Short mmCIF file of C-alpha atoms in Angstrom, two decimals:
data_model
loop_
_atom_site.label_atom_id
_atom_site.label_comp_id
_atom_site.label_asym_id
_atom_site.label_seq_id
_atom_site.Cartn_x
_atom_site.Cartn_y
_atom_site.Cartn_z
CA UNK A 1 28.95 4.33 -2.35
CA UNK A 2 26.38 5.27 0.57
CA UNK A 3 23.44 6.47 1.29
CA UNK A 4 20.06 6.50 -1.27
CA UNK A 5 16.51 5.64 -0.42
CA UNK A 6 13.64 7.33 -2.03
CA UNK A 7 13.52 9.33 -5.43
CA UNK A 8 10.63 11.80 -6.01
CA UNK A 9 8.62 10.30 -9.20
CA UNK A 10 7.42 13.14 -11.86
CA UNK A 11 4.38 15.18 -10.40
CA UNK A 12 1.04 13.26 -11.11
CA UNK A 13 3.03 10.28 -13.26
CA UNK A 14 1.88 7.30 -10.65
CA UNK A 15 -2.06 8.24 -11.26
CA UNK A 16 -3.20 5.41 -9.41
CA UNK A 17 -1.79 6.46 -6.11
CA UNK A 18 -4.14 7.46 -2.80
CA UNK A 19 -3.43 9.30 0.02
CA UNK A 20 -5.43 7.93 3.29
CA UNK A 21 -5.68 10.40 5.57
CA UNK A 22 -7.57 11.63 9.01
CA UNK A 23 -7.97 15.04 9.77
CA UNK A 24 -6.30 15.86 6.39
CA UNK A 25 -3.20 14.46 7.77
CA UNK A 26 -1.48 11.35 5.73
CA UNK A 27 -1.15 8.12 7.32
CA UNK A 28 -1.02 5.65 4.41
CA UNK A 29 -1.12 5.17 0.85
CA UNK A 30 -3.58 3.28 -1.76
CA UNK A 31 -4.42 2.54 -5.03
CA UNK A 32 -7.32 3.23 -6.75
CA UNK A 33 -8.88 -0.09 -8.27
CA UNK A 34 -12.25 0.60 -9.32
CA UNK A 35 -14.02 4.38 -9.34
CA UNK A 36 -15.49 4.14 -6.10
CA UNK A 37 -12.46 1.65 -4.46
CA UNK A 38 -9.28 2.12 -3.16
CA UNK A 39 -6.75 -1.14 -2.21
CA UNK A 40 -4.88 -0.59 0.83
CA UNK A 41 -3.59 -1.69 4.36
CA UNK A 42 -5.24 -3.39 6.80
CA UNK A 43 -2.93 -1.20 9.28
CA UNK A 44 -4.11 2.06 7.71
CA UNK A 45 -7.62 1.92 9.67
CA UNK A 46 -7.58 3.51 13.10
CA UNK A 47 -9.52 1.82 15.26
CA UNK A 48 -9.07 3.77 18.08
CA UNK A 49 -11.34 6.65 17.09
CA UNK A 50 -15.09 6.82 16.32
CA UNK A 51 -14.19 9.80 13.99
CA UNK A 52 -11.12 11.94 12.92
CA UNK A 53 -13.02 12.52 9.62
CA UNK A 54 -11.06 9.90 6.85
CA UNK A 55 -10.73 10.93 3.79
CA UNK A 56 -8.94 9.77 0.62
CA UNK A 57 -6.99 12.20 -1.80
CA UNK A 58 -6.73 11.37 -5.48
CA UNK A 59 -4.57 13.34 -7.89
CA UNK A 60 -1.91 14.15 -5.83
CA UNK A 61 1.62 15.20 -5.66
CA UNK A 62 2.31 17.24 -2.72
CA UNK A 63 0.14 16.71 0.58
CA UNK A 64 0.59 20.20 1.39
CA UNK A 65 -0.18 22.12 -1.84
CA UNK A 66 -3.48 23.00 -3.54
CA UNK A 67 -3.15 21.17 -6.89
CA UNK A 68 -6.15 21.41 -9.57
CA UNK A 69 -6.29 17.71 -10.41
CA UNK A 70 -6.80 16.52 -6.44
CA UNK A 71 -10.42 15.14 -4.99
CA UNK A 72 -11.25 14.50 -2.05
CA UNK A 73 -13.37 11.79 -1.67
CA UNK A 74 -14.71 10.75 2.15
CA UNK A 75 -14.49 7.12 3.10
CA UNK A 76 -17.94 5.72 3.54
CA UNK A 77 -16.45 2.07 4.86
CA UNK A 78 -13.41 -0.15 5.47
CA UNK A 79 -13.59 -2.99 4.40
CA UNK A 80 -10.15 -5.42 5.96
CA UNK A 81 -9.92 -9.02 5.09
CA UNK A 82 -11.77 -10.90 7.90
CA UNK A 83 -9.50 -12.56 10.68
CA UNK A 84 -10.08 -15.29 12.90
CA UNK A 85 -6.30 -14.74 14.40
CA UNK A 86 -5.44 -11.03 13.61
CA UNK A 87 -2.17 -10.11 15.55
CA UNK A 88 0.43 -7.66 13.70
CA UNK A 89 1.38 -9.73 10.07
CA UNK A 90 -1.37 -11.15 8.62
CA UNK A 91 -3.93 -10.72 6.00
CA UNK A 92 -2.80 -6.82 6.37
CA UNK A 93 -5.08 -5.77 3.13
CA UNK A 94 -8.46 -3.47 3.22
CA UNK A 95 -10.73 -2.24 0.88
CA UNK A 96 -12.18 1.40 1.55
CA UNK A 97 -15.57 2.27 0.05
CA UNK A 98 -15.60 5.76 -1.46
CA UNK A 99 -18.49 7.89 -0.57
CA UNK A 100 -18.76 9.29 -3.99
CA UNK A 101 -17.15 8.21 -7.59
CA UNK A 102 -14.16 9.49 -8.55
CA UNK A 103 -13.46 11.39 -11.77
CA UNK A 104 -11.44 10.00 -14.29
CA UNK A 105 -8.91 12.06 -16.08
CA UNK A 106 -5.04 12.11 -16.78
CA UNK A 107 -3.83 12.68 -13.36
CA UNK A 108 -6.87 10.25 -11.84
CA UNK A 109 -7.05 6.96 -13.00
CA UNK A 110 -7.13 3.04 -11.55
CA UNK A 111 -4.73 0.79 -11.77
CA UNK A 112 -5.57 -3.32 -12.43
CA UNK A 113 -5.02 -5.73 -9.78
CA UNK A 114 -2.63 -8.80 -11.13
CA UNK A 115 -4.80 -11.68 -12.27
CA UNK A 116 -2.10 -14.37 -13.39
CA UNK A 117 1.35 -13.37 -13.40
CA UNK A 118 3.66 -15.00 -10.68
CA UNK A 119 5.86 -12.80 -8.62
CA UNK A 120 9.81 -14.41 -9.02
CA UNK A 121 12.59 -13.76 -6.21
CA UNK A 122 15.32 -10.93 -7.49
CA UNK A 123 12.64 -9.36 -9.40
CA UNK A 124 13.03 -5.78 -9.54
CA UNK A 125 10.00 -3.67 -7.58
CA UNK A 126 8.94 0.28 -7.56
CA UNK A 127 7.47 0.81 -4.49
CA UNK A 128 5.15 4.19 -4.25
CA UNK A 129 4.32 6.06 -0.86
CA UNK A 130 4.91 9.60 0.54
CA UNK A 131 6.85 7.04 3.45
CA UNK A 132 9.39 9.58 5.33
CA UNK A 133 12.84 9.52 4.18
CA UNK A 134 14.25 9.78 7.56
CA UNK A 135 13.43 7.05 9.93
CA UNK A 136 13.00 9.47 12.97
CA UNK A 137 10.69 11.78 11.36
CA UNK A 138 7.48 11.62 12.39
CA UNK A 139 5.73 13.32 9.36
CA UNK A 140 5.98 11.48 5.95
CA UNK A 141 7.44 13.17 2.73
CA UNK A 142 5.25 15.88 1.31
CA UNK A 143 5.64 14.78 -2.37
CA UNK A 144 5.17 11.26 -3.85
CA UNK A 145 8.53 9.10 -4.04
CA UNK A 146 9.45 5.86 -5.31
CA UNK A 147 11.71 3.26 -4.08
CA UNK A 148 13.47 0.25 -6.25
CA UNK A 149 13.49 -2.61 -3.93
CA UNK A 150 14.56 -6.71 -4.62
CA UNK A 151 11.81 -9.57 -4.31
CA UNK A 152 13.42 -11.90 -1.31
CA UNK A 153 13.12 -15.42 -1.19
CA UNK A 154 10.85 -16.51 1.23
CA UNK A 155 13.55 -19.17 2.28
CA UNK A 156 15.83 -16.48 2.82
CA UNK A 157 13.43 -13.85 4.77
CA UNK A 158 11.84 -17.04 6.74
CA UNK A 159 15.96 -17.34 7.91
CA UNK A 160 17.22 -17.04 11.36
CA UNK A 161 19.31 -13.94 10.37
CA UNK A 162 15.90 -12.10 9.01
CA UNK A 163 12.38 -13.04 10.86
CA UNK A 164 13.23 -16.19 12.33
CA UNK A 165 9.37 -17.64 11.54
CA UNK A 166 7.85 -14.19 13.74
CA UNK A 167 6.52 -12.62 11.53
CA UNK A 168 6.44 -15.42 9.51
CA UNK A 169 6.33 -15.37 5.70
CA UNK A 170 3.59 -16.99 4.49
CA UNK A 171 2.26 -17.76 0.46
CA UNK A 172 0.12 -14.84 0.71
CA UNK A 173 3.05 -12.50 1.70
CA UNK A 174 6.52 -11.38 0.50
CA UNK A 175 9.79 -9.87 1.25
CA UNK A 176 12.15 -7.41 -0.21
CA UNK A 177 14.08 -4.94 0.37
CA UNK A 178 17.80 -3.62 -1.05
CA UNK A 179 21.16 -5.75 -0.85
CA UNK A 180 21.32 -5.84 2.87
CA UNK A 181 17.80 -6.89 3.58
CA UNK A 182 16.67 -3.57 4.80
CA UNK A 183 13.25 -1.55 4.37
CA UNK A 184 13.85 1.81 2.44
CA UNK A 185 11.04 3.76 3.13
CA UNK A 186 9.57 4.87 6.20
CA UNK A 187 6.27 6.49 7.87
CA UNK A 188 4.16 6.62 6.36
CA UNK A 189 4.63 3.89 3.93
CA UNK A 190 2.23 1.01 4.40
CA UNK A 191 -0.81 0.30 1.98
CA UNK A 192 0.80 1.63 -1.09
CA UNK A 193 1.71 -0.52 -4.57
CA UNK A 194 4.75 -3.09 -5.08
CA UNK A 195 5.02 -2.69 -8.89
CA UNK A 196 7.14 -5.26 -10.78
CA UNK A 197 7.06 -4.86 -14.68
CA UNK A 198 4.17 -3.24 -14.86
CA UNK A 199 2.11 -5.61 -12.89
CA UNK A 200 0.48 -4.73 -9.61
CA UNK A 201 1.58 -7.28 -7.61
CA UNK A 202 1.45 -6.31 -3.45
CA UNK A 203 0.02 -4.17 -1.08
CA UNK A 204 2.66 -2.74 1.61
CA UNK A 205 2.00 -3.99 5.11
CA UNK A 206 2.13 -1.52 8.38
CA UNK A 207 4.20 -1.38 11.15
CA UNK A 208 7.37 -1.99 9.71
CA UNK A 209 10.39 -0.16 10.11
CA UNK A 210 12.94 0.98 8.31
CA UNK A 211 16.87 1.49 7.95
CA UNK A 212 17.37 -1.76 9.72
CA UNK A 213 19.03 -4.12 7.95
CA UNK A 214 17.86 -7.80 7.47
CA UNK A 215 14.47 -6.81 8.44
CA UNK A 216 13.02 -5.96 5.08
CA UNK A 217 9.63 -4.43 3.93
CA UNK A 218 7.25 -6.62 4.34
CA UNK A 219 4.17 -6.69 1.07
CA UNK A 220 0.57 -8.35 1.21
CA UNK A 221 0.68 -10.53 -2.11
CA UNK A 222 -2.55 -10.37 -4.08
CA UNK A 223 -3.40 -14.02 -4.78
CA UNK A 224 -6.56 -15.51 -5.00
CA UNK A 225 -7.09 -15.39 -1.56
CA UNK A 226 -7.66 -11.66 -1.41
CA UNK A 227 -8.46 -11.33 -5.61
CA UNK A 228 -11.74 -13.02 -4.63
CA UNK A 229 -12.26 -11.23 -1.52
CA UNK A 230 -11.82 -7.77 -3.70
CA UNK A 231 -14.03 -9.21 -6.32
CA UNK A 232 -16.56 -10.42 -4.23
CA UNK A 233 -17.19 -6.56 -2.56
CA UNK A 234 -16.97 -4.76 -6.01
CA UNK A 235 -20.95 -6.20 -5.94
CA UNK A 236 -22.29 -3.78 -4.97
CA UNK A 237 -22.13 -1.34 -6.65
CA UNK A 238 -24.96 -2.40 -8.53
CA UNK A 239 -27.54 -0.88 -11.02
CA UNK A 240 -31.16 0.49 -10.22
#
């Protein structure tokens, strides 16, 4: 009757998943979309460094271990939706070029962007990070978790008693969180997957917290306006 936020999934079942990470430490998550592409946050990019050597990490499990089906791949270039009016909430997506290609295998693969389904409120969402399972911890969870969280109406989150219009929830974005409006996973959280029956429907947005109720997580929706974007930069690559 209390307390439960964050199972850890099988080792190497959520193949898709991407650790960002400078210096080799984890700040975000991603998904892997194409073999040289990885879908994240906008907040994942650290602008306050020249360096810090980024790096993603593919076939992962444990951030700490040696496992025989990770690569790390450096970042060549992020790529975040352009912003006239930037500001925390909004248009909190970013595409990072790989350096090299990734290898395919069981424990490495990409995962489709949605193209057409619609996203309903109540639906039920697996959210996947290595987000910290305690709010005051300042280093995220060393193995891959998974979080069941509620689609929101947008009438409800747009409500005085949740975001009161700052941030404010537009089309492109979308609330959930469990029965009390609250954000289950923490640090280390942002630019990872909202899943909904088997569709990849949202990118997690940064600087969020969590454990607060009626402040729910808060997801970049992938619709057209960002589907183009993505499509539009997966040219190049191109041939010879």
């Amino acid at each position: 009757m209390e307390i439960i936020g964050g199972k850890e999934v099988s080792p190497h079942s959520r193949p898709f998943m991407a650790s960002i990470q400078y210096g080799g430490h984890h700040v975000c998550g991603g998904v892997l979309i194409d073999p040289q592409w990885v879908l994240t946050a906008a907040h994942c990019q650290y602008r306050f460094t020249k360096g810090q050597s980024p790096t993603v990490v593919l076939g992962a499990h444990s951030l700490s271990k040696n496992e025989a089906s990770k690569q790390t791949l450096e970042i060549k270039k992020f790529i975040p939706f352009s912003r006239v009016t930037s500001d925390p909430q909004s248009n909190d997506i970013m595409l990072v070029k790989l350096q090299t290609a990734a290898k395919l295998n069981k424990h490495v693969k990409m995962l489709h962007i949605r193209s057409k389904t619609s996203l309903r409120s109540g639906t039920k969402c697996k959210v996947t990070g290595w987000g910290a399972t305690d709010p005051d911890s300042l280093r995220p969870s060393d193995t891959l978790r998974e979080v069941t969280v509620t689609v929101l109406s947008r009438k409800l989150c747009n409500s005085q008693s949740y975001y009161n219009g700052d941030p404010f929830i537009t089309k492109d974005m979308v609330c959930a969180g469990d029965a009390k409006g609250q954000k289950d996973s923490c640090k280390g959280d942002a630019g990872g997957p909202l899943i909904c029956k088997g569709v990849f429907h949202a990118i997690v947005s940064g600087g969020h917290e969590c454990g607060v109720a009626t402040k729910p997580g808060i997801y970049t929706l992938l619709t057209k306006k960002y589907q183009t974007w993505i499509k539009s930069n997966l040219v190049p690559p191109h041939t010879n």
